[PDB]
Nucleic acid binder design. Structure first.
Ligand SMILES: [Mg+2]
Ligand SMILES: [Mg+2]
Ligand SMILES: [Mg+2]
Ligand SMILES: [Mg+2]
Ligand SMILES: [Mg+2]
Ligand SMILES: [Mg+2]
Ligand SMILES: [Mg+2]
Ligand SMILES: [Mg+2]
Ligand SMILES: [Mg+2]
Lengths: 48, 108, 46, 237
RNA sequence: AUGAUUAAUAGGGACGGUCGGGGGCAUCAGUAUUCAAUUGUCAGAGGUGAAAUUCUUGGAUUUAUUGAAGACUAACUACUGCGAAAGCAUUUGCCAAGGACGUUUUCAUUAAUCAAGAACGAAAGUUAGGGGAUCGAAGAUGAUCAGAUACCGUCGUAGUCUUAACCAUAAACUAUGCCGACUAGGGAUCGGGUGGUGUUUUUUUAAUGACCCACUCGGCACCUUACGAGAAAUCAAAGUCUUUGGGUUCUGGGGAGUAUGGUCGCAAGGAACUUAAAGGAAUUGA
């Protein structure tokens, strides 16, 4: 206990935070997969 | 601070916020600093709530940064108890003094 | 309820032998068993 | 403590009588900013009337937010110091003296889980104006990053610092201060630092934190008038 | 010029690109403290739980433009990094050093533990110079009112800094000898390397990054469990299938008092007497 419980709390929060971030990336990649599945001046400047 | 506590600033006209750091009281580093924060909060936050109830204030303990919301006389009373905890006073001794001042607060 | 566990601070039997100016180990008999038998008898004669 | 119970002090014995209101003798003066800024009117100041008034005026420094001078909140967090150099008919002609950020903005950018990169260079303009520039940058995490932090190795930091010093030195040397101030307002310097240091490591919140004026050459009224863009009197009878 | 075998997931050396708040010498910056110059205004400023010394109408405190001195590197700062430990956070350059990684390079037992014997060793402290801003043992002084604020305020010696030597002590901690082998799962991070992939990239100046996934060495750590251990707290070691042999160094056999046929130490100096007592108290009594 003491200081050691507090340090445990921080690591668990970071671990929980990482899970949320990773799930967001997986969700986004699924959207990209679905998206992939489904003026003269501007064309001259499309490369920029 | 909690929203309902923050509303007190709108409702009343004589509530202020006092702010200070742990390093201002004493140069604590490493585990010594972390233990000091735990001493202010106490187990389950009981020490922080004891100060809040006794002095009629609200305290936010953001790492080494302490903010106290309440009346001018009240926040000074809360500040002294917090500072004693930082200097090393055990929570039990601070709790006793809180009971003494808490008694005085009612009679007046 | 504030309790702090006490600090444990740190003359061996060997040093007791050398406490005198001389080394007590260096003045001993060859047969201690014979000595004890003879001391007890001589004490009774005295 | 003005109470009667307060113990008497030695200094209370003899006190000068207040017999003149100082603002009776003060005279108001209007401060004008260089042409590099959109809003020239930057307030007014006061001085004791000449018995001269100009001597107290010269060397006076006033600091004002860029938002007022440019009329846009995008510069709310940046302050510009202007120093009085010439006086003409209650108009105080001022020149650039320095630049700095508000403390609240500086504290906002500094955050945990990232590396703080700060670089400084002492360099002179083509006008022989010696000045010191401070730059600040922070690392950022990529779009697909999963690590909590975005720390950069000291090799990257030293590489980024070298690039920043080259850009700050290059622009100041190949420019006048009036030109240099013209660069500060649109923050083109920061965008240049971004692109140059980018391949080394992604960065965020790249800004020129502060500008100091260490030395000045001989004052030139002719140049000052050109920056601000003489008058006959009226017969008194 | 000429006799032997491996090349140990032993060791040493070499080479390659790295990595580091590792070290020494210079160098650059940053506000802050104190002081000083100029500047505007006028009665307080300071400090405490409350006050008093103290400073102040020759202008204190406060304001603005500067300068000088000596320290120190905030935020970034994290259960992250380096070093044998003590310790080490501004920039740039120089000097040498170093762990890990990569290697189809080299030597070939050169090793482990270590009486004897050697280098470094926080803070404080001793000798002799320098410096002396901040804080500050000692000393002086204000106040001695009130128990949550109950020891505070002002000046401040030695010291704090540095140069050349001494001192060698810390709760100098895993409160835990070293070397080697083996015995569980999990994913976070630092350094190196390998492969894939697609974003940020970008172009014959050159030069090489960031992120994601998988793997692999080395490291600071962490979480869940031990078919093991322990009385227990707990332990990936404090384990090695009922009682015991992988190698080697050191060490052992709490809190209060009582007395002493013992040992060693420890200073300075050249005159009472009253009635015992109502011989009293008293706004209160007789
Ligand atoms: Mg080999
Ligand atoms: Mg090498
Ligand atoms: Mg003044
Ligand atoms: Mg690091
Ligand atoms: Mg820094
Ligand atoms: Mg000395
Ligand atoms: Mg230590
Ligand atoms: Mg082992
Ligand atoms: Mg890796």
């Amino acid at each position: 206990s003491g200081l050691r419980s507090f340090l445990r709390k921080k690591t668990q929060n970071v671990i929980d935070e990482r899970k949320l971030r990773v799930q967001k990336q997986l969700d986004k990649e699924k959207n990209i997969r679905k998206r992939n599945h489904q003026d003269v001046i501007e064309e001259a400047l499309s490369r920029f | 601070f909690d929203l309902d506590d923050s509303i007190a600033l709108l409702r009343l006209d004589d509530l202020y916020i006092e702010t200070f750091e742990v390093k201002d009281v004493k140069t604590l580093t490493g585990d010594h600093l972390s233990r000091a924060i735990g001493r202010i909060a106490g187990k389950d936050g009981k020490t922080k709530f004891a100060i809040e109830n006794a002095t009629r204030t609200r305290i936010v303990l953001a790492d080494s940064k302490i903010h106290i919301l309440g009346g001018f006389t009240h926040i000074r009373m809360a500040r002294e108890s917090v500072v004693s905890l930082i200097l090393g006073s055990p929570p039990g001794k601070v709790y006793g003094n809180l009971r003494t001042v808490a008694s005085r607060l009612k009679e007046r | 309820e504030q309790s702090n566990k006490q600090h444990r601070k740190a003359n061996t039997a060997k040093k007791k032998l050398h406490t005198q100016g001389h080394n007590a180990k260096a003045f001993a008999v060859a047969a201690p068993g014979k000595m004890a038998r003879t001391m007890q008898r001589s004490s009774d004669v005295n | 403590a003005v109470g009667k119970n307060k113990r008497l002090s030695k200094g209370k014995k003899g006190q000068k009588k207040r017999v003149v209101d100082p603002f009776t003798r003060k005279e108001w003066f209007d401060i004008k900013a260089p042409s590099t800024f959109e809003n020239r009117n930057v307030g007014k100041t006061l001085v004791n009337k000449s018995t001269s008034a100009s001597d107290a005026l010269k060397g006076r420094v006033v600091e004002v937010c860029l938002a007022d001078l440019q009329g846009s909140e995008d510069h709310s967090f940046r302050k510009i110091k202007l120093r009085v150099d010439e006086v003409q008919g209650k108009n105080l002609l001022t020149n650039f003296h320095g630049m700095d950020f508000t403390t609240d903005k500086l504290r906002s950018m500094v955050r945990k889980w990232q590396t703080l990169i700060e670089a400084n260079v002492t360099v002179k303009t083509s006008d022989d104006y010696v000045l010191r520039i401070f730059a600040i940058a922070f690392t950022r995490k990529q779009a697909n990053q999963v690590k909590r932090h975005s720390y950069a190795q000291s090799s990257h930091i030293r590489a980024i610092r070298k690039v920043i010093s080259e850009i700050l030195t290059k622009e100041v040397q190949g420019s006048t201060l009036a030109q240099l101030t013209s660069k500060l307002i649109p923050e083109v310097i920061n965008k240049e630092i971004e692109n140059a240091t980018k391949d080394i490591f992604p960065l965020q919140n790249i800004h020129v934190r502060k500008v100091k004026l260490l030395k000045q050459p001989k004052f030139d009224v002719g140049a000052l008038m050109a920056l601000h863009g003489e008058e006959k009197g009226k017969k008194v009878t």
